């Protein structure tokens, strides 16, 4: 059948101009039409616009007429969503999908990439340990930038009762996230826990032992 | 311009059971040459991609288990999951293709009705590694709890604290439907010596009295 | 306002080419003719041409048949009539009119006339 | 085991005109529509209401397959909501547009190097045609009030105006066919439906 | 082509004498397609009449053509000094549309 590939995901400063590409490989593509759809840290999915990739005729939704321009290569089968000097609220994760007409649903969807625009540089992540019939340990994953992080424990050997949070953005531009995991606390000296951290933006990779407090 | 509401913001049910989302156009999205009303429900999992649940408002695509029904005409239509599944768990929107441009629904966020469970509450004080970079942050995890509503205040001193907190919960752990929050209180290390006890109130239903974990600066 | 907006003159050496504009606004045009007439100053009217805008078709005098061509663009609605190989006795002004129409009949006579186009040729 | 006659109206060795479009019906067949991919080439192929992909698993009571030829810069206007003189004086289709339209450019078979001034385009009418309404009057088109008694001059202008498809023309005036395929499902009983 | 030969050359007369001009063809001109045009020294040619003996929207009442064949005729009948132009005949219905040569009314 159909299927859509987007291009990687991108970090990128405010000002600066960006082109998500969505190439189609499947049976059939000269009857699809691509769509651009926005979905921003949360919960909303809003129709951006669609095009045709065999002529250009495109149709943009009234909230991004004069801020987004759509355009399409049919030699490649590829659809382009294009902004020149963004700003920091186009953080999000754009998806495209494939409808074999206009007036047709949503068929075959991509995989989405991630847009992230921020005035911030790229900085290596800060781990700091989280000491305690059951005891919580963890690692307080601070001050990383971009998205995202990878935390194990040590290495993968236990992954039961591990919660790792979702990130979250502070006032300074930078992330945080948290990672526990809930022990006995009768094995607490006789078994040694440690975070693995992987910042690959920064191709920083950190093992931190977490010990009880004295 | 068409516009979508979904009836219900959030929906729990438990499993195995009924669940039901509503639909209300602002207009009708009947096509006079086939007589099909041009709406469909998709489906997105944490992480992935909407996949296209049902169109036509009752048709379901090639690659849906018979659980997911959808129906309504004119303006009312209905997406009815009869065998709730771990599956299930996911943001369900309905869209209209009747004309340009496109509109999806508010989005109504399904969930595994389990048995109110009381959150473990613990308390992290800031590592003396990190009080060398001048900036403390105190951690609290709540673990494994149900309903999602709780409430965490952050008292210094007895001292109510806002403006400074941030929190962050979990998804939906499919194995005993419960969730998990931390929230991260951050002080500079000046701010932060001036201060003696550090207490993390939570409240949620299932719990008697309002849990208190603090502890001493010392 | 449905008026009939042409170009400003223009001072063009012997030998040169010139074309001059014909806007009309404020009727339907697209079934609409226009037709080009020059006229010396204190002088008789010397019938140039005229076009159809639907089709294109133009039918010019015997003098300038060889000389003139009357164009038109119905995406902007503009008529152009261009000259070429100016003598001195082309010194004249050049007007374009249309007829009326405001749906879908037209006037049988050329009401609305352009303001005029002097087309001045010297060394 | 009736196949639909979709083929006599694509592999076609004459195509109409667009003011005098040709239309077939289709009825009491099984209509497979796989040549509608991997089959020559389209250059457009624009689906409104309904998904090809999923044709072959429908039935419709009324299916039309209108036929004509035009030029690239008008295979836009074959379309739901189009203006121009190609939308209004020669072929319309309606708001609710439910089925396709394949374009694919016929310049090695429309085109002369004399020019090919067969296929004619109607110019002038009194008012828009209305969805799927054919004209095909030679009258002189009255532009005034004064009666044109068959001889044309001012307000008197013959209303077809023709292509003059050349092979050195560019794309956008280079003839190509066009098909439009029309799904309608009425209160009768459906009878054109495809391989289910 | 057909000529428009207009008689007389000029004229003068007076507020309140009917003045009447005439332009005759070589050969029969159709009525629906013969204008009378005024021309003020200035502006563009103003369409008095058109077709034949059919006033244009805003021409006052006084100016009135008629006539027939290869014989054409406009008449005033109030002289206000509105009527201070020249006059021109163009038949339309030929293969070259012809003009007069201008009939000026020099009015006192
Ligand atoms: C066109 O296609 C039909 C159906 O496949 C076939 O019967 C017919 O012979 C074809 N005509 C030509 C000229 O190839």
């Not at chain 4, 020559?40 to 030829?69: H, I």
């Not at chain 4, 739901?80 to 090695?108: E, M």
């Not at chain 4, 008012?127 to 009258?139: A, C, G, H, V, Y």
Request: glycine share 8%; net charge positive.
């Amino acid at each position: 059948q159909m299927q859509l590939v987007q291009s990687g995901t991108e970090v990128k400063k405010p000002g600066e101009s960006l082109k998500i590409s969505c190439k189609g490989s499947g049976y059939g593509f000269i009857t699809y039409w691509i769509g651009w759809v926005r979905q921003m840290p949360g919960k909303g999915l809003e129709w951006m616009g669609i095009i045709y990739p065999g002529d250009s005729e495109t149709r943009y939704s009234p909230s991004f007429q004069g801020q987004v321009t759509i355009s399409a290569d049919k030699s490649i089968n590829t659809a382009y969503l294009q902004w020149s000097s963004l700003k920091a609220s186009d953080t999000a994760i754009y998806y495209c999908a494939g409808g074999s007409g206009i007036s047709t649903p949503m068929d075959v969807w991509g995989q989405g990439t991630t847009v992230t625009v921020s005035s911030a540089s790229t900085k290596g992540p800060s781990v700091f340990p989280l000491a305690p019939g059951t005891a919580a340990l963890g690692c307080l994953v601070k001050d990383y930038f971009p998205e995202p992080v990878t935390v194990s424990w040590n290495s993968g050997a236990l992954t039961s009762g591990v919660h790792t949070f979702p990130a979250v953005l502070q006032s300074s531009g930078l992330y945080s996230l948290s990672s526990v995991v809930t022990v006995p606390s009768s094995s607490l000296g006789t078994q040694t826990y440690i975070c693995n951290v992987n910042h690959k933006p920064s191709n920083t990779k950190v093992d931190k032992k977490v010990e009880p407090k004295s | 311009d068409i516009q979508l509401t979904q009836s219900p913001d959030s929906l729990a049910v438990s499993l195995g059971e009924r669940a039901t989302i509503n639909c209300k156009s602002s207009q009708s999205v009947l096509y006079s040459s086939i007589n099909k009303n041009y709406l469909a429900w998709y489906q997105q999992k944490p992480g992935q991609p909407p996949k296209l649940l049902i169109y036509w408002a009752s048709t379901r695509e090639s690659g849906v288990p018979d659980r997911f029904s959808g129906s309504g005409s004119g303006t009312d239509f209905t997406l009815t999951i009869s065998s709730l599944q771990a599956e299930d768990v996911a943001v369900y929107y309905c869209q209209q293709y009747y004309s340009t441009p496109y509109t999806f629904g508010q989005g109504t966020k399904v969930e595994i009705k389990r048995t109110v469970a009381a959150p473990s509450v613990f308390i992290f004080p800031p590592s003396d590694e990190q009080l060398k970079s001048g900036t403390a942050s105190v951690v609290c995890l709540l673990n494994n709890f149900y309903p999602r509503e709780a409430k965490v205040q952050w008292k210094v001193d007895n001292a109510l604290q806002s403006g400074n907190s941030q929190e962050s919960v979990t998804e939906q752990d499919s194995k005993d439907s419960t969730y998990s929050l931390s929230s991260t209180l951050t002080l500079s290390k000046a701010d932060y010596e001036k201060h003696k006890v550090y207490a993390c109130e939570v409240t949620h239903q299932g719990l008697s009295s309002p849990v208190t974990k603090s502890f001493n600066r010392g | 306002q449905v008026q009939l907006v042409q170009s400003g003159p223009e001072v063009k050496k012997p030998g040169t080419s010139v074309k001059v504009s014909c806007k009309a606004s404020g009727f339907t045009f697209t079934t609409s003719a226009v037709q080009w007439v020059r006229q010396a100053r204190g002088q008789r009217l010397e019938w140039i041409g005229w076009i159809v805008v639907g089709s294109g078709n133009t039918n010019y005098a015997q003098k300038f048949q060889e000389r003139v061509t009357i164009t038109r663009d119905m995406s902007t609605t503009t008529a152009y009539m261009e000259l070429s190989s100016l003598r001195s006795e082309d010194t004249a002004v050049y007007y374009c009119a249309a007829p009326y129409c405001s749906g879908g009949t037209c006037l049988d006579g050329f009401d609305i006339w352009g303001q005029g186009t002097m087309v001045t040729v010297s060394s | 085991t009736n196949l639909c006659p979709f083929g006599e109206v694509f592999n076609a060795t004459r195509f109409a005109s667009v003011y005098a479009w040709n239309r077939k019906r289709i009825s009491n067949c099984v209509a497979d529509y796989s040549f509608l991919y991997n089959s020559a080439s389209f250059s457009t192929f624009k689906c409104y209401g309904v998904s090809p992909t999923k044709l072959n698993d429908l039935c419709f009571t009324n299916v039309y397959a209108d036929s004509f030829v035009i030029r690239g810069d008008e295979v836009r206007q074959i379309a739901p909501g189009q203006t121009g003189k190609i939308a209004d004086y020669n072929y319309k289709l309606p708001d609710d547009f439910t089925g396709c339209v394949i374009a694919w450019n016929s310049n090695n078979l429309d085109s002369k190097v004399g020019g090919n001034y067969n296929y004619l385009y109607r110019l002038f009418r009194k008012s828009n045609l209305k969805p799927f309404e054919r004209d095909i009057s030679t009258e002189i088109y009255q532009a005034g009030s004064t009666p044109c008694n068959g001889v044309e001059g001012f307000n008197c202008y013959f209303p077809l105006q023709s292509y003059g498809f050349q092979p050195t023309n560019g794309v956008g005036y280079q003839p190509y066919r066009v098909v439009v395929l029309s799904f309608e499902l009425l209160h009768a009983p459906a009878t054109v439906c495809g391989p289910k």
